């Protein structure tokens, strides 16, 4: 014979609890990647982005190492 139902209240705040949020953690991860790729893509033209980030990527990085010949440069 069972006298009482067996349960606990999980901690929660603003209607979020850990079991639910934990299911969404990977989704925040992917959104973060999306935002990172997006942001980096938006500033790919910025010379500092090329110098500091993009040209350092192995193999691929030579795409962003481009020199104007001194003969063709007024400045």
Ligand X SMILES: CCCCCCCCCCCCCC(=O)OC[C@H](COP(=O)([O-])O)OC(=O)CCCCCCCCCCCCC
User: Which does residue 34 bind out of ligand X, other proteins, none, counting CB within 5 to 8 angstroms by kind?
Assistant: ligand X
Rounded CA separation 55/49 (Å): 8
Interface map 22-41 toward ligand X (x if CB under 6 A): --x------x--xx------
User: Which does residue 60 bind out of ligand X, other proteins, none, counting CB within 5 to 8 angstroms by kind?
Assistant: none
Q: Does residue 46 contact residue 55 with C-beta atoms inside 8 Å?
A: no
Which stretch, 2-10, 19-27, 46-54, 59-67, contacts other proteins (CB under 8 A)? 2-10
User: Which does residue 4 bind out of other proteins, ligand X, none, counting CB within 5 to 8 angstroms by kind?
Assistant: other proteins
Q: Give the torsion sign (CA, 59, 55, 46, 42).
A: positive
Q: Which of residues 4-23 bind other proteins (CB under 8 A)?
A: 4-5, 7
Among the listed residues 74, 54, 53, the one whose alpha carbon sits nearest the alpha carbon of residue 64:
54
Among the listed residues 27, 25, 30, 50, the one whose alpha carbon sits nearest the alpha carbon of residue 40:
50
């Amino acid at each position: 014979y069972v006298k009482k139902p067996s349960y606990k209240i999980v901690p929660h705040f603003l209607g979020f609890n850990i079991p639910t949020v934990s299911k969404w953690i990977p989704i925040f991860g992917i959104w973060g990647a999306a935002a990172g790729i997006g942001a980096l893509f938006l500033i790919e033209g910025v010379p500092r982005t090329r110098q500091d980030i993009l040209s350092k990527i192995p193999i691929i990085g030579e795409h962003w190492i481009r020199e104007i010949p001194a003969s063709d440069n007024p400045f």
